[PDB]
Structure 1
């Protein structure tokens, strides 16, 4: 589990969204596994605005932050997981690393802020849903 809290936005994995998320929807995209809902309280996370390919992600199933290199956001074929069939997922970045279903929502961060959240795992790869292209999270 995990979310990003920026401005009056809450960013979560679409497969972990709550009724309150859907009842306060801003934007959602199944192909990216992302959903954004509106918040009453201001959040303090900064979204990275950059093309970094190195950062650190949180792996809840190891209670550890791991430094990783990660790929550019792309359309990646993902094997079946407990929450999606095998499919193409968009805006996805991969690294070599550990990722269980419970690790979804862990933050990937670089020197510029939050890059994305854990979304996929298996075959010794961890996939992160990028948020750096969602420039509107920074305003309004």
Structure 2
């Protein structure tokens, strides 16, 4: 589990969104595994606006933050799971790192701010849903 709290927005994995998230919906995209809902309180996270390919992510199944090198956001095949059928997920970045189901929502960050959240993984890989192209998260 986990979310990004920027301005009056809460960014979560679409597959882990709550009923309150759907009832306060701003934007969702199944192909990216992302959903954004509105918040009453202002958050403290800032979004990175850069092309970094190195950063640090939080792994809840280890209670640890790990440094990683990650690929550029791309269209990658993600196998059928209990949340989606076999499909291509867009804006996804892969890295070598530990991940389990329950680690989705952990933040990946670089020197400029938050880059994205854990969305996929297995067999010593971890995948992150990029948020750096969502410029509207910085206003209104």
1:106–1:117: 8 Å Cα contact kept in structure 2?
Answer: yes
**Does the C-alpha gap of structure 1 residues 92 and 132 become closer, same or farther in structure 2, counting only changes over 3 Å?**
same
Greater shift in the superposed pair: 32-41 or 118-127: 118-127
Give 3-state SS (helix, strand or coil) of 2:102's partner.
helix
Q: How far off its partner does 1:114 sit? A: 0.4
State the superposition RMSD in angstroms.
0.8
Q: How far off its partner does 1:81 sit? A: 3.1
Structure 2, unpaired ranges of 5+: none
- TM normalised by structure 2 equals 0.97
- TM normalised by structure 1 equals 0.97
Corresponding residue for residue 114 of structure 1: 114
Corresponding residue for residue 39 of structure 2: 39
Runs of 4+ in 1 over 3 A off after TM superposition: none
Give 3-state SS (helix, strand or coil) of 1:22's partner.
helix
**CA offsets 1:48-100 (integer angstroms, 9 cap, x no match):** 00000000000000111110000000000112334223210000000011111
